Amino acid sequence: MISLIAALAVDRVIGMENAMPWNLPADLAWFKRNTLNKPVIMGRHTWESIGRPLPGRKNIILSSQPGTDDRVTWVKSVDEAIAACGDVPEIMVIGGGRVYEQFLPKAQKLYLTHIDAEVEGDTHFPDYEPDDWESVFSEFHDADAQNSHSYCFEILERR
């Protein structure tokens, strides 16, 4: 099974200038809980944005060019990325925009954080078709002293 996990600001914005400008510790904790002990697939730009391997996960990087770091696994196509995960119950696709576009048609589950924040971005999560997806979990949180925007954790499953 392939799942996508992402955090979306208003208008499906996910990034600006190869960064995420907000800081929501509760959402990073959600990301870690839902990805730990699973393979994670990311594009090269997202690898550069994170800047280090994510511990406790097999890190698989898509790039058309040879890898530059043997602490992670480098692959050159979607099918190779999936194969490199082996026989696991759930593969996590962690972006960015171009990678999400390619994996969306193959995904059964979306883990989405909806952040009540306006930021002028250059990368968006794919337009997906709402009729294709059932919301099976949602949990709303007001802003607090640690998290400066309200946010909603949602899990959707392909109908």
Ligand X SMILES: Nc1nc(=O)c2nc(CNc3ccc(C(=O)N[C@@H](CCC(=O)O)C(=O)O)cc3)cnc2[nH]1
Binding-site members are 5, 7, 13-19, 27, 45-46, 52, 57, 63-64, 76, 95-102, 113
117 binds, among ligand X, ligand NAP, Mn ion, none (CB under 5 to 8 A by kind): Mn ion
- Interface residues for ligand X in 24-53 (CB under 6 A)? 27-28, 30-32, 46, 49-50
* Of the residues 93, 123, 153, 155, which one makes contact with ligand NAP according to CB under 6 A: 123
Binding mask 33-52 for ligand NAP (x = CB under 6 A): ---------xxxxx--x---
Burial of 121 from C-beta contacts in 10 A (0-12 / 13-18 / 19+): buried
Minimum gap (Å) between residue 55 Cβ and ligand X: 6
Binding residues for substrate: 5, 27, 52, 57, 113
**Helix, strand, coil percentages for the chain (3-state, nearest 5):** 25, 35, 40
CA–CA separation, 27 vs 84, rounded Å? Answer: 27
Strand segments (E) across 9-132? 13-15, 40-43, 59-62, 73-75, 91-93, 109-115, 123-124
DSSP at 19 = B
Minimum gap (Å) between residue 82 Cβ and ligand X: 18
Query: Can residue 136 be called a binding residue for ligand X (CB under 6 A)?
Result: no
Which residue type sits at 103? F
Stretch touching ligand NAP by CB under 6 A, among 83-91, 92-100, 103-111, 146-154: 92-100
Q: Is the separation of the CB atoms in 93 and 108 below 8 Å?
A: no
Which residue type sits at 55? P
Contact set with ligand X (CB under 6 A): 5-7, 20, 27-28, 30-32, 46, 49-50, 54, 94-95, 113
